[PDB]
Amino acid sequence: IANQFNSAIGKIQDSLSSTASALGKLQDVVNQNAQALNTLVKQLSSNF
Amino acid sequence: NKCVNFNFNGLTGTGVLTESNKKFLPFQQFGRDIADTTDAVRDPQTLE
Ligand SMILES: *[C@@H]1O[C@H](CO)[C@@H](O[C@@H]2O[C@H](CO)[C@@H](O[C@H]3O[C@H](CO)[C@@H](O)[C@H](O)[C@@H]3O)[C@H](O)[C@H]2NC(C)=O)[C@H](O)[C@H]1NC(C)=O
Numbered sequence: 081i082a083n084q085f086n087s088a089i090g091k092i093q094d095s096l097s098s099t100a101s102a103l104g105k106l107q108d109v110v111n112q113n114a115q116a117l118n119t120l121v122k123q124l125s126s127n128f
Numbered sequence: 129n130k131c132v133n134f135n136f137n138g139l140t141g142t143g144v145l146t147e148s149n150k151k152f153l154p155f156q157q158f159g160r161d162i163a164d165t166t167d168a169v170r171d172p173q174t175l176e
């Protein structure tokens with residue numbers, strides 16, 4: 081049970097060292113605030 | 129390097145002027161930000 085746990089914590093560490101998209105839940109929440117502000121700055125270019 | 133009410137060629141504003149390192153081509157008088165607002169100018173009496 082200790083070897084299986086220690087190995088599974090090892091798989092988490094290697095998985096987080098390998099793929100990007102797993103943290104997309106958090107990165108998308110940063111990207112949406114950044115995109116909303118980039119859009120609000122762009123609207124200062126509209127003539128209306 | 130002081131805040132001033134600047135006016136170049138009738139492009140009035142308020143800001144602190146500074147020595148830039150942008151390379152405006154001979155046909156360009158103003159440089160613009162993402163918000164269509166002027167963030168560099170070539171001076172009409174010395175071509176810097
Ligand atoms: C319950 O599942 C366990 C796997 O999670 C399993 O443990 C594994 O048992 C085998 C041997 O039966 C080990 O195989 C390796 O053994 C040595 C290295 O230690 C090598 O000489 C072999 O070539 C082979 O690589 C596994 O290492 C071992 N894994 C772990 C995490 O201990 C149990 O045997 C299973 N128990 C029952 C009762 O079925």
Ligand SMILES: *[C@@H]1O[C@H](CO)[C@@H](O)[C@H](O)[C@H]1NC(C)=O
Pocket residue numbers: 172173174
């Ligand atoms: C403006 O005035 C200076 C100093 O009198 C003179 O040297 C310069 O040639 C003038 N600028 C232009 C663009 O000719």
